[model samples]
Target: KTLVYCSEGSPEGFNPQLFTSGTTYDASSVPIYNRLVEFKIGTTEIEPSLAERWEVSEDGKTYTFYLRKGVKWQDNKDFKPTRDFNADDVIYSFMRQKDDKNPYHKVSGGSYEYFQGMGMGDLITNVVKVDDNTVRFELTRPESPFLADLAMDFASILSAEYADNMLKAGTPEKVDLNPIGTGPFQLQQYQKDSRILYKAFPGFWGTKPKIDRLVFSITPDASVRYAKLQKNECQIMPYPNPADIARMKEDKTINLMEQPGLNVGYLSFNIEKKPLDNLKVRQALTMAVNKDAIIDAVYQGAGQAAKNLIPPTMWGYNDDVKDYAYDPAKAKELLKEAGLPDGFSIDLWAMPVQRPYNPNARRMAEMIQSDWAKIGVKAKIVTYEWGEYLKRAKDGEHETVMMGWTGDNGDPDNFFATLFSCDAAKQGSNYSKWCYKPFEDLIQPARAEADHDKRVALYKQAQVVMNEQAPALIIAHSTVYEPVRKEVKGYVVDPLGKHHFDNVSLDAGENLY
Candidate 1:
């Protein structure tokens, strides 16, 4: 009977392999849909519902996993658990990741840079079937983060039988609507922009969830969601709005869990576009705006100002390096130096429902537009849906854009080089159309360097260069918030914001006061 309210609605589709980025947010939803190998609770890693145990070879190039025996799909049909989740399924999952036709390439959605950077194509050389319950993966090079990569949501297992069944029925799209997985929960029903329902899986391999039914309702408006929380119509909500935060702080009846979030929001220049293509122009644009003022005024103490591409809380982030402080006079001087005393005109692209890092993105963009006018750079603001916005940004359709990135695998390589890599840009990933071969060269070896100190140092150097070049100006660190009912206990907000719900449940016995 216990349920939580999600401000961001459930996914439009249920196919975890194909719809990895959108709609799938919580651990409960993603694992049920089969999106990852291991479940990560904040920084602690746990074996997934399907995978029981795994081993690594001496060289760290091969990983052999054994699935828990006796797991069954939600349909209740008997499955030979030993053979059902063998090497073929693992191979199929990895091949799907590598397959250009699959449309779910790891790099395409910025999930993980491992595939493109380390030639994971070359590593993970083969998937061998050792037995009915065991599968071994061979890699070309030692990947210390190999297990961690498997733990990512992008590495979720797929139902081989379900995929085959759909293919045999000559209805591939049906799988998207009706997904089947071996997890703690099963998809019961879904209505677009309305509600999604799930029932606990009795055939699950691990301890079953306490809640029999899980429901997620979509309330798009922040005010409406807050109203639902006040009315007890929704158990939990995101953001709750800055105004709502104040009201919640005063209310004795509610339980509010607040932490400093790790996401960063910044403006990027399309290096391929005119005016912005010039470094001086890019630097001028970067210096013009006051990130501190934007964070303080627009966020109203909800978030912190950011000057580094990687936020301060992240690993490998160099706090010693100075941030791009607010300096309007410096920005104006750079404008004159770039041969534009009158301030050139440019368009800034953003999307309505996208820019996941920022909750108040449109407002921030508008405020930034007004601030840029002071430095003689007139910015024309534009907004689009998340999907279309990314399409246009990749196509080099705009001169400048406001975008945000979250760390993919908890590594700096994911930020500095994976995002701005020259080759990745050509492949429709680099939104700013920014490229630097030297940076690429540094990123490639860092992936396989294995030595912690060496890799961290390489990442630090790359970040410094990114800061100096100013391809994208780091603006503010986005805040992530979650509210829970006082009756609910043992639940934590994940740093990555992606968490599994099986381990979370209502502890009605505990007192919050």
Candidate 2:
């Protein structure tokens, strides 16, 4: 009746609209909320969740969503919904992040990174309720990624009635801190840096959760999480250390799930900084680092050296794209050409948490430090906790940053537009601060081109521009691992790099001991 998952880190907050971390989504969005649309569990295909069906305009600039009626929002001490889920709830959830003038926009420090990264503010011009059960979205232009973007965690719907009540009570912040949704699970308890507990929502509209209770045993260390899984202190865990895979596979009590991650790991250069502003300098830094050796050491045989940002598992990947060769002498020569014959010093920021894409970022940073040293680049390694690391990196605090991305939607735009766009460099998720107009020109048109082959052509061209521009040193595309106790049933690895347990159950027979 209970399922415990050893989550890797603390969420920045329960508000899905504010942060981009999968850790935050795993705890908040995946459990407590549902979007207008949702990625079919275990796959990238879009399916209805809150919205029963939808229609797009011939020009693709407008989307009409017919809502599912009689859906009940989960109740809590702070507020209870007086009405069922409707068009207003959907509009309220989005407009909170979309409209800066809205009261809820500035409630919790108001930074919508994913929303800005996807350029949704510009793409979506308006949302209007046609009727109680029907809503429409007005777009500035045709966007091929809009539907898939709605299915993303950032699009999780909130209760408009609850927000109104919270505002009346002068506690608007509680709307974010104490979330209410029509999803299968409801948050019961959350202890920062410790654990979170959820109970099945008895009033859930969809299929009820298989378990009565769900718990997130927050353990950040890879070995500690695996240890908890083995002891059944937690029934499941993700992002296991690659070195222990063989031993875990041999264990009888565990069922290990492995998949080629739809992700990329990289060390992004801040183009706004001097020396790094030079194209030859960026290329020199890229060639100087030995990615193959880093994969062999850091990924420990669970990663492929990357030539492109989008992983090969995705459709838009460029199979024939050329990569910078790992020639230190050539890197030195490029440094000389850039007028830095003796390499310059810059701080390299690494995350103090493990991710599906990069198991050991600190170790990877150390290896990069050593490699850059070979080409005369003196690198200083920097780090902070997961939340601070993301905050500062996005704020452009470091000259170089170790960041990774797991595709939220299967579309190439999820990687291209979210992480590489000019808008992202200004205030979104572009940690590198690289704003090459050539790259943006290709991806922006690709977003409007619905034709599959045409879109692919544009994306392939964008990847080439990314390589030639050398904004970031693309490192590896990793293989992800999730290990669960035999007692855990119906659990599958979410390729989008999140953990969802609505359908997971604890086998009574196996738990008898």
Candidate 3:
């Protein structure tokens, strides 16, 4: 039986380390490869995947991973590995990203987006192959989130043989198009902006997928996707608009699975840009916007206003850090103090597509624009194609941009340090361009500290600093709603927004065609 899943759009590429978009991850990384450690299906708890077991040093600065042996790489039209997956492949994957001197780092347009985004590039000191089946990682300092970081999609292991063969064949740049991994499914075919086809791998070492074939039908429109699901053309659909929930629930053939999402949607001020650099101006802009009204309108009562960068579900979340309430009068006062009695004009960038974290970014941008106008601020909303939008935003090209993140790992550092760190600003994810030393002082130490209470205290202080500084407007934490056909069983929707199809199977008596 085949499972037809509808994805929101095409992925940027199949190379996990090169891109940061969750859409790309949903389409490629999640299914195509396996990480050393993996998040337990439906939970944040870590589980062994490629690596059967691992040992952490007492100081928490070194990790020794014992890889599962005899795992076969997916054989495809591109190339096959001459040997089984081992420590060499793991070393190659880490070195290619962590070392600038590695040849593969510059090959195939490698950027290591998430690896560098989380500041792992600076944190990891060395990766060494201890033996054919074991690998060791040494870090500059102890980081509790290191294991969690490895569980992320960006850390998905790659076949070193594939990279070497591609380079020797003079087509090194086509590595992403010809991915080879130890995943349960193999990429059979892919068409840009159309569909991706996968077949169950006979040599898979782990839980064999019950479905023999899987197809991701690229349906960009949510309405069209829902229509396909209604007709039994697709088994699963992603990012269903809130307006369609009532009708979806009424359908007997459909099942809606939902959970409080681990994410945040917000407006980011480019602190490097003009008057926005002023604290009063930034505070004024954040104060003028009504988060409650925006959440009600944009989320359709499905989300809560964000008070802190890290969501409440994650550890180290500071409940005491309060967000600036909507006060137009206070906004005006702050603006006047900043010498902008007549508020200034700036470009506001909205995402061109729907995301799990934000159902409709463009509409949210419109609401923010209207709110700013009431405070005498002339706002211009700008947007580009989804890919271009991310590129421009990362380049710090806008005065303000709308974007959000679904937590890759369950750690609070994954949200706070990755989104607000000075290293992130240099790497591109820190869109606010906020590189406050005081903020970094608290965050950096909290990451290396082994004590839970002390780490929590440091994070709480960091959130306080963020609240006082007002670098970005903390908008809302959304609740994710996904609709699936009743014929599909064992389909679990991870709060992190990952779709794991290995355990999912079509009903035995159901006619897939």
Candidate 4:
């Protein structure tokens, strides 16, 4: 039996450092580079992978990890696993983020600013290799979130030899593209905008992949991908639309599976730029938007209208917190108070394929543009190719940009610390540059809270700060939807948007009609 996977866009950057966020199109890529620690299926528990056990210092700054021996890379040469997965590899990956010569260090204006802000500078003082199987990470200050940071893709252990070879040649991006990690599959071929192929490694240390080959076909249209899944041409399609899901439910031949996703799409403002940076201008724009209408018209009510950047299903969601009421008059009043009695004009950076939900992303942007115009805001719309659009957003080249983010982890820190933090603006994800000292103070302690209830409360307080500030008027909480053939089993949907194919099994016992 063969398993087919299809997605709307091609995976542009495989280099983990360049797009450390991981590719949205290549949902199954993570399993190829196994995690050191990851969430349990449908739960927030941190389970082990390469490392057998780990312990954090009482102060939380230091982490002592005991590695598993005998793990091997695909090549099967002298991977030595001992020499390669040492403490140095871990230190190199983090240090590269701050290195001035590293292109990725500045790509998103330093994506790991949160790491540095958490006193990582003091915590990661030295990497002491106690033995071939034990590594101790020494930090100057206590960092409770260090384990969470380790769960990041950037920490994926890479071969020091591979990285050093590329660095010597002045080609760091090349290293990311051809990453050598301890996983079940290795990157075999990558033809830009066409396909990426992976071959199963017989030497994989974990459960071997049943399928001999894995292929990701780059089909950019949602309808085309849906058609592929319907015909059994593709065994897995990650982001199937609502219409297709309804059809799948009626069809006995396919499986319709969905889970709540952690992503929240928003209309972002350039806090560093004019008109948008003004609170009154932002309020008027938010008032003019008809979120319920947009939800019905674009998403077909498949998603929840977002009252805050943090989704309600998240740990921090505060039911008592209120959202901006859809009051056009109040919006107008705010606009007048900001001295812009007549709504000013700015271009909304819309893209075709990069939205959190909706297959017809271009059309969805048009719908939002029209909705904003109804409230007297003259929103001139501009469209860009997906890659170019993201680049411009990162460079702060647009006044307002449309974008979406799926939390890396299920924690509230994924929403508040990573996306909304002031340091994130210095990075590209926080394109709005919306910084509030009060908000930061609240979120910082919340992350360190050992009690779950107190942590949730802190997240709630931060959400309130966002609701009143309007740095980014969140549009919706996306629902994760996928359609698979009936032959597929052992399927579990995760809310964090991570796709793991290791536990999945497919049967060809039944015939396709």
Cα lDDT listed for each candidate: 0.66, 0.91, 0.87, 0.68
lDDT of 4 by residue, 294-339 (tens): 7776776678888888776776688777877888878878877888
Q: TM-score for all predictions? A: 0.88, 0.98, 0.97, 0.91
**What's the TM for model 1?**
0.88
The list of candidate 3 runs beyond 4 A from truth reads 509-513
lDDT of 1 by residue, 373-406 (tens): 9887778889876546665676678787777766
| lDDT of candidate 2 at residue 192, scale 0 to 100 | 93
Sorted by TM-score, highest first, which candidate order results? 2, 3, 4, 1
So what's the TM-score on candidate 4? 0.91
Better of 1 and 4 by lDDT: 4
**Which lDDT tens digits does candidate 2 get at residues 374-425?**
9999999999989988998888888999999999999999999899999898
Q: What is the lDDT for 293 in model 4?
A: 73
Give the runs in model 4 whose Cα sits over 4 Å from its true position: 20-29, 76-84, 99-127, 168-172, 354-359
What's the lDDT for residue 150 in model 3?
A: 89
Q: Which candidate number maximizes lDDT?
A: 2
lDDT of 2 at 205: 96
Instruction: Compose the digit string of candidate 3's lDDT tens values, residues 125-177.
Output: 88989999999999988998899888999898998888888889888776777
